[PDB]
């Protein structure tokens, strides 16, 4: 359980009261201004190696739903792009809106997408996620925008279990899932140094935000929107608009992998 949320009283505007790093120098998300984000030809190609992925559980954590992976060995890993070394996939989760016109955390020329998928990875130079979160290169989060259109067949297994995890703390087995089914065809990206977008807002993340959104259906996104922030029998707070808005870029540069 957790004290914070996305309401007027417990939401992003107030997180700095408990997490003063909320007003820090490398906070996420950010707007990606395509007039000022510059192509960097020294960026390597991004390497997604998810064939050996081992999914474990799906959980309503009170702010989102998350799907966890066995990160005890190099199985599903992210390498290349801006990264040095190997980063193991730990979990994925989403942020979404009440309406299709909002829901993403990152924006592109101020445009908000209907949702955003985060695949969270940690740097194996550290022992575990707990050590990695204390370092500036501890995590790599691969961010993928969702737009509404045709169904994403690789999302359907997720959508099909959401009715079983409606309220905070509900969970299920979630085995044999292939996260490659959530990727777009193109791996062109923007990258910058930032932070977790949820508490504790640690400044430990290399963000890799893909340019090409995936398409999901209205049925699929509606299932997201029928989840609850609350626990069982508590006053219903539909789980929508669980996104932090864009934060000041301060001294940073966003780099593009493409011209």
Catalytic residues: 63
**Secondary structure E strands in the chain:** 31-32, 38-39, 46-49, 55-60, 65-69, 77-80, 87-96, 107-108, 115-123, 139-148, 171-173, 189-194, 205-210, 214-216, 255-256
Instruction: With H, G, I as helix, E, B as strand and everything else as coil, classify residue 4.
Output: coil
- The least CB distance from residue 197 to Zn ion, in Å, is 5
Separation between Cα atoms, residue 175 and residue 254, nearest integer Å: 36
Q: Residue 149 contacts by C-beta under 8 Å, 6 or more apart in sequence?
A: 215, 216, 217
Using the minimum distance from each CB to Zn ion, give the nearer residue, 26 or 118. Answer: 118
Longest dimension (CA), the chain: 54
Cβ closer to Zn ion: 105 or 137? 105
On whether 93 is known to bind a ligand per the annotation, the reply is yes
If the CB atoms of residues 106 and 118 are measured against Zn ion, the closer one turns out to be 118
Site string for Zn ion, 103-122 (x = CB under 5 A): ---------------x----
Residue 118 labeled ligand binder = yes
Task: Name the percent of the chain in helix, strand, coil, to the closest 5.
Answer: 15, 30, 55
Find the binding residues for Zn ion in span 15-44 (CB under 5 A). Answer: none
- Count the site residues for Zn ion by CB under 5 A: 2
- Least distance CB 199 / Zn ion (angstroms): 11
Judged by beta carbon, residue 13 or residue 52, the one nearer Zn ion is 13
HSE-CB of 163 using CA atoms within 13 angstroms = 5
Nearer CB in complex with Zn ion: 118/170: 118
* Residue given tokens 């011209």 in the structure block: 259
**Window 116 to 175, contacts with Zn ion (CB under 5 A):** 118
Angle 246-248-252 from CA coordinates, rounded to 5°: 115
Least Å from the CB of residue 160 to Zn ion: 22
Is 35 labeled as ligand-binding? no
- Smallest separation (angstroms) from Zn ion to the CB of 116: 7
Asked if residue 1 binds Zn ion (CB under 5 A), the reply is yes
Binding span for Zn ion by CB under 5 A among 1-9, 31-39, 227-235, 242-250: 1-9
Buried b (16+ CB within 10 A) or exposed e, 37-50: beeeeebeebebbb
Smallest separation (angstroms) from Zn ion to the CB of 118: 4
* Gap between the Cα atoms of 140 and 155, Å rounded: 22
Is residue 16 a known part of a binding site? no
Annotated binding-site ranges: 93, 95, 118, 197-198
Annotated binding-site ranges for Zn(2+): 93, 95, 118
Binding interface with Zn ion (CB under 5 A): 1, 118
Annotated binding-site ranges for substrate: 197-198
């Amino acid at each position: 359980h957790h004290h914070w949320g996305y309401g007027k009283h417990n939401g992003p505007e107030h997180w700095h009261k408990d997490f003063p790093i909320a007003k820090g120098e490398r906070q996420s998300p950010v707007d990606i201004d395509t007039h000022t984000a510059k192509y960097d030809p020294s960026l390597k190609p991004l390497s997604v190696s998810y064939d050996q992925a081992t999914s474990l559980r799906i959980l309503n954590n009170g702010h989102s739903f998350q799907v966890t992976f066995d990160d005890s060995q190099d199985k599903a890993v992210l390498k290349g792009g801006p990264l040095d070394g190997t980063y193991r996939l730990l979990q994925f989760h989403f942020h979404w809106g009440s309406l299709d016109g909002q829901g993403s955390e990152h924006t592109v020329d101020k445009k908000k997408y209907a949702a955003e998928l985060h695949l969270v990875h940690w740097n194996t130079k550290y022992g575990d996620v707990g050590k990695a979160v204390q370092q500036p290169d501890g995590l790599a989060v691969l961010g993928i925008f969702l737009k509404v259109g045709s169904a994403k067949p690789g999302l359907q297994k997720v959508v099909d279990v959401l009715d079983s995890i409606k309220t905070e703390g509900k969970s299920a087995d979630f085995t044999n899932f292939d996260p490659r089914g959530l990727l777009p065809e193109s791996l062109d990206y923007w990258t910058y140094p930032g932070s977790l977008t949820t508490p504790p807002l640690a400044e430990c993340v290399t963000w890799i935000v893909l340019k090409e959104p995936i398409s999901v259906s209205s049925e699929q996104v509606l299932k997201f929107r029928k989840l609850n922030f609350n626990g069982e029998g508590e006053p219903e707070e539909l789980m929508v608009d669980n996104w932090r808005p864009a934060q000041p870029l301060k001294n940073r540069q966003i780099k593009a992998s493409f011209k």
